[PDB]
Amino acid sequence: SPFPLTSMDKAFITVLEMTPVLGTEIINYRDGMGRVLAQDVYAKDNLPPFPASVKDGYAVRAADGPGDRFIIGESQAGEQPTQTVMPGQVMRVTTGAPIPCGADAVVQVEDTELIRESDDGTEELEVRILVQARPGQDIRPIGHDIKRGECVLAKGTHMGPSEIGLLATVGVTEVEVNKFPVVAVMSTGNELLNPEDDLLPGKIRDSNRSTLLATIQEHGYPTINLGIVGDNPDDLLNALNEGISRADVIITSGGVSMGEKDYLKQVLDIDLHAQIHFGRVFMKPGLPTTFATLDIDGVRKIIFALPGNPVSAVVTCNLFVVPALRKMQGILDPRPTIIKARLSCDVKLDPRPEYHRCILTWHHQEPLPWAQSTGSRLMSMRSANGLLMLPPKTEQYVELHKGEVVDVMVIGRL
Amino acid sequence: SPFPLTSMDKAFITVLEMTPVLGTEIINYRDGMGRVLAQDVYAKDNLPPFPASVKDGYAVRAADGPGDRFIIGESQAGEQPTQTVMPGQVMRVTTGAPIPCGADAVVQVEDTELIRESDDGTEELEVRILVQARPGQDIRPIGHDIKRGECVLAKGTHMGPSEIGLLATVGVTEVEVNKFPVVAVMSTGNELLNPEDDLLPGKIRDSNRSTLLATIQEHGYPTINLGIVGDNPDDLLNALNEGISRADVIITSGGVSMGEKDYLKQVLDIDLHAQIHFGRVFMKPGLPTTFATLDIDGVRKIIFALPGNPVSAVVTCNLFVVPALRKMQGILDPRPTIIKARLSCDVKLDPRPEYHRCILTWHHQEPLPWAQSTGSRLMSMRSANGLLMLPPKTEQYVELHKGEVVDVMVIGRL
Numbered sequence: 038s039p040f041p042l043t044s045m046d047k048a049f050i051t052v053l054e055m056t057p058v059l060g061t062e063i064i065n066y067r068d069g070m071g072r073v074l075a076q077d078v079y080a081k082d083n084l085p086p087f088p089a090s091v092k093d094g095y096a097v098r099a100a101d102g103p104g105d106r107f108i109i110g111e112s113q114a115g116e117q118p119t120q121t122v123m124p125g126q127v128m129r130v131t132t133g134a135p136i137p138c139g140a141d142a143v144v145q146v147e148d149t150e151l152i153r154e155s156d157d158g159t160e161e162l163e164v165r166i167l168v169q170a171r172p173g174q175d176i177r178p179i180g181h182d183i184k185r186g187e188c189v190l191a192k193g194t195h196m197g198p199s200e201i202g203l204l205a206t207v208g209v210t211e212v213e214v215n216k217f218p219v220v221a222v223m224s225t226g227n228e229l230l231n232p233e234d235d236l237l238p239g240k241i242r243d244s245n246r247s248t249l250l251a252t253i254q255e256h257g258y259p260t261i262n263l264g265i266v267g268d269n270p271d272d273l274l275n276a277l278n279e280g281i282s283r284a285d286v287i288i289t290s291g292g293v294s295m296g297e298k299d300y301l302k303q304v305l306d307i308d309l310h311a312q313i314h315f316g317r318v319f320m321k322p323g324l325p326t327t328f329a330t331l332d333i334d335g336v337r338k339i340i341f342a343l344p345g346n347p348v349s350a351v352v353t354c355n356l357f358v359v360p361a362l363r364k365m366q367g368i369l370d371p372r373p374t375i376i377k378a379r380l381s382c383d384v385k386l387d388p389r390p391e392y393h394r395c396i397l398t399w400h401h402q403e404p405l406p407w408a409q410s411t412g413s414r415l416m417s418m419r420s421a422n423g424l425l426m427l428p429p430k431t432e433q434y435v436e437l438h439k440g441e442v443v444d445v446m447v448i449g450r451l
Numbered sequence: 452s453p454f455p456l457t458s459m460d461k462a463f464i465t466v467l468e469m470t471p472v473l474g475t476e477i478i479n480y481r482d483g484m485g486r487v488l489a490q491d492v493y494a495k496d497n498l499p500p501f502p503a504s505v506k507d508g509y510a511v512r513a514a515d516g517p518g519d520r521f522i523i524g525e526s527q528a529g530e531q532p533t534q535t536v537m538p539g540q541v542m543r544v545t546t547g548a549p550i551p552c553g554a555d556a557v558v559q560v561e562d563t564e565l566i567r568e569s570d571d572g573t574e575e576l577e578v579r580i581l582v583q584a585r586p587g588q589d590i591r592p593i594g595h596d597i598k599r600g601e602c603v604l605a606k607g608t609h610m611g612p613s614e615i616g617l618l619a620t621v622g623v624t625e626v627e628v629n630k631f632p633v634v635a636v637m638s639t640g641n642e643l644l645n646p647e648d649d650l651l652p653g654k655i656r657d658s659n660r661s662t663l664l665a666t667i668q669e670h671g672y673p674t675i676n677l678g679i680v681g682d683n684p685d686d687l688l689n690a691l692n693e694g695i696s697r698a699d700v701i702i703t704s705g706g707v708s709m710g711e712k713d714y715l716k717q718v719l720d721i722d723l724h725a726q727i728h729f730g731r732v733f734m735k736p737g738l739p740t741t742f743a744t745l746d747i748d749g750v751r752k753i754i755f756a757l758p759g760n761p762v763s764a765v766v767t768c769n770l771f772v773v774p775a776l777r778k779m780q781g782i783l784d785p786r787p788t789i790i791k792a793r794l795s796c797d798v799k800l801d802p803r804p805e806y807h808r809c810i811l812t813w814h815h816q817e818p819l820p821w822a823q824s825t826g827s828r829l830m831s832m833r834s835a836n837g838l839l840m841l842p843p844k845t846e847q848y849v850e851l852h853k854g855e856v857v858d859v860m861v862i863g864r865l
């Protein structure tokens with residue numbers, strides 16, 4: 038228009054408030070990594086489902102006290118015992134094996150001495166119990182860990198390996214979860230060639246599509262590659278329509294400044310009939326970043342039209358796109374994790390809040406990590422795992438110094 | 452034997468020193484996420500490959516100074532200009548467009564006023580240049596960002612989205628990288644049922660296989676599911692042989708304590724002829740953790756025989772297995788990231804170093820995160836992202852208090 042300059046705070050809130058939560062689907066539990074449960078999950082069995090030994094040793098009668106005992110048999114893992122332990126008797130048990138009838142405590146083998154074994158030494162016959170067992174000692178009673186009817190996982194849980202293990206434990210192998218967003222990515226510009234191409238006069242290779250797709254894929258979301266689209270409204274409209282058909286989210290880059298051939302905002306508004314919620318953001322980099330929604334038949338499509346500059350594209354993708362995707366896949370608090378870190382070098386502040394990729398590193402016993410802006414030798418073997426978030430300058434603060442504590446958004450595994 | 456108690460420090464060093472680095476393969480650059488480069492990568496072109504405008508504005512002759520100028524045409528993105536800018540003339544340019552011959556500076560549109568346009572207002576004809584351009588201002592010379600022949604990525608680089616983008620930029624679409632390890636996982640025990648099974652007397656469901664496979668998959672490595680193997684040496688040998696054939700790494704759980712039917716160490720040694728480097732570790736949990744190598748025809752297979760207890764299995768998988776896998780896939784320093792955090796509650800120290808899953812959380816402006824051991828309500832919607840690493844007790848230190856700073860290994864995205 039030019040569009041109003043939107044504050045970072047308002048732009049971010051706007052993205053999260055306007056982004057929908059996707060519907061649900063049933064998945065196999067093995068496919069649950071990174072998913073959010075859309076149901077409560079209940080145990081249908083006790084864990085353990087039988088009284089289980091905590092130790093390798095002997096199932097005893099505590100009332101017998103210490104002394105010499107005949108071993109009447111063994112309770113082996115996976116087998117329900119058939120014998121009853123009577124006074125003066127014990128049964129061998131291993132960890133996790135059921136406690137036989139008649140026994141009420143377990144004595145670990147270290148608190149015993151073997152008296153007699155078979156001639157071939159493969160079977161124990163008599164044992165000395167050296168201790169007075171406490172009632173129920175070293176036994177896990179039925180349901181000690183999980184009770185039948187217990188809710189073991191609540192709706193809203195963002196699942197990792199241990200949650201998958203818990204689903205396996207309780208035998209709930211199919212679960213309702215939020216869908217993952219399908220994200221389509223296109224690049225724009227008459228100057229762009231594919232990465233596979235040799236250069237031609239006036240041209241460069243398209244890097245944003247690769248960087249953006251890789252960023253989305255890193256977070257586990259399925260993607261669609263919409264290729265390179267030229268700087269003309271008909272082609273852009275057609276590509277956007279393909280993205281809308283095939284995906285939940287459409288990400289473009291380029292064509293959003295006020296240049297003569299920057300057409301995307303016009304197309305989104307007049308041709309696509311989308312609602313542009315902001316078209317400029319007071320931030321460095323990322324001034325022309327644009328966010329739109331399009332509602333079709335009760336479905337809300339999300340569109341991010343990111344700046345063409347490759348550094349701007351990847352920065353704004355991490356600030357705006359990834360949190361939106363997290364909300365779409367059902368994460369209750371989709372905000373990224375922000376940590377405190379020490380600046381590795383002096384930095385000049387801008388009237389705009391500034392963002393820059395960095396690497397976070399912990400130094401021996403020092404409590405806070407150091408943030409080193411990208412762009413020594415070994416400090417190039419690691420990919421960026423942070424985004425420095427620097428405040429706007431003020432009459433007082435014009436520069437931040439090495440050692441000062443700043444906010445860093447986590448964008449890679451630390 | 453029982454095997455000697457190995458210190459945590461020695462066990463860890465032993466795993467890393469004895470674990471091999473896998474060989475290399477050529478991959479498509481799009482598949483590069485998490486891979487380590489095994490070659491240096493060089494640019495074969497300049498970036499930019501032509502002198503490129505930094506701004507939307509006009510290509511001018513600085514020697515003309517400010518004044519009124521005829522616009523002879525436009526340099527559009529993706530097109531090599533054909534006209535030469537003469538004294539008194541300018542050419543329209545957009546960001547990233549080539550600078551035409553004859554021009555030596557760019558003046559951004561904000562430093563101009565339009566004098567004359569075509570009757571239909573689609574073409575600019577005359578413009579007032581309001582400033583004295585500095586020589587070469589707002590032009591990116593050829594090779595400003597990347598020079599032909601420049602090494603843009605070094606061997607040893609662990610790649611993320613920005614590295615993939617750089618490969619795309621320089622048109623290096625196939626790259627030599629280290630292979631990823633293929634990891635086979637089996638569970639052991641006569642008491643185990645599949646997750647899909649209803650319970651039978653004396654039985655429980657196998658959770659470790661799911662938890663371990665999910666842990667490995669989370670780090671991006673391919674896996675093989677070897678199922679449930681009974682407590683007998685013939686079956687265990689056959690399953691191990693299948694794992695050796697199909698995978699680089701074999702992970703078992705269960706059968707490694709001194710119980711009667713704990714057979715794995717015997718099988719590894721006498722039947723498989725593997726070299727067991729440790730069979731007990733002075734740690735809590737994880738006492739019976741076992742690490743072996745097997746060298747066949749100049750190939751080293753790695754075997755981790757983890758404890759059967761499900762908490763022990765997942766803890767030791769994170770402490771020993773994941774760092775080994777990182778070394779195998781070529782990461783130069785495969786050690787996990789260890790951060791400092793404040794204990795959320797008092798904790799009792801053990802003679803053994805203790806490890807427990809936790810959740811790391813940052814509180815408003817407080818510099819250090821808090822570590823809350825797993826096992827409020829909302830503090831159950833998030834999966835564990837840390838492993839608390841508590842020191843052995845001493846005559847002095849028997850307990851750690853809420854607020855005290857401890858080491859936490861990162862195991863999930865923060």
Ligand SMILES: Nc1ncnc2c1ncn2[C@@H]1O[C@H](COP(=O)(O)OP(=O)(O)O)[C@@H](O)[C@H]1O
Binds near residue numbers: 132640
């Ligand atoms: N895959 C598994 N899933 C769940 N529990 C298991 C699994 N494997 C073993 N366990 C349980 O862990 C405990 C220890 O099993 P065991 O095979 O004796 O381990 P170890 O001998 O290595 O200590 C037993 O209670 C057993 O039932």
Ligand SMILES: Nc1ncnc2c1ncn2[C@@H]1O[C@H](COP(=O)(O)OP(=O)(O)O)[C@@H](O)[C@H]1O
Binds near residue numbers: 299
């Ligand atoms: N996919 C891409 N890969 C690499 N560079 C790009 C890409 N898209 C745009 N650029 C470059 O970024 C700069 C800005 O492009 P432009 O389309 O004008 O973005 P905007 O109008 O959003 O600022 C130009 O130098 C352009 O060549």
Ligand SMILES: [Mg+2]
Binds near residue numbers: 225226227528
């Ligand atoms: Mg463009």
Ligand SMILES: [Mg+2]
Binds near residue numbers: 291292293296299345
């Ligand atoms: Mg532009």
Ligand SMILES: [Mg+2]
Binds near residue numbers: 114639640706759
């Ligand atoms: Mg067992």
Ligand SMILES: [Mg+2]
Binds near residue numbers: 707709759
């Ligand atoms: Mg055992």
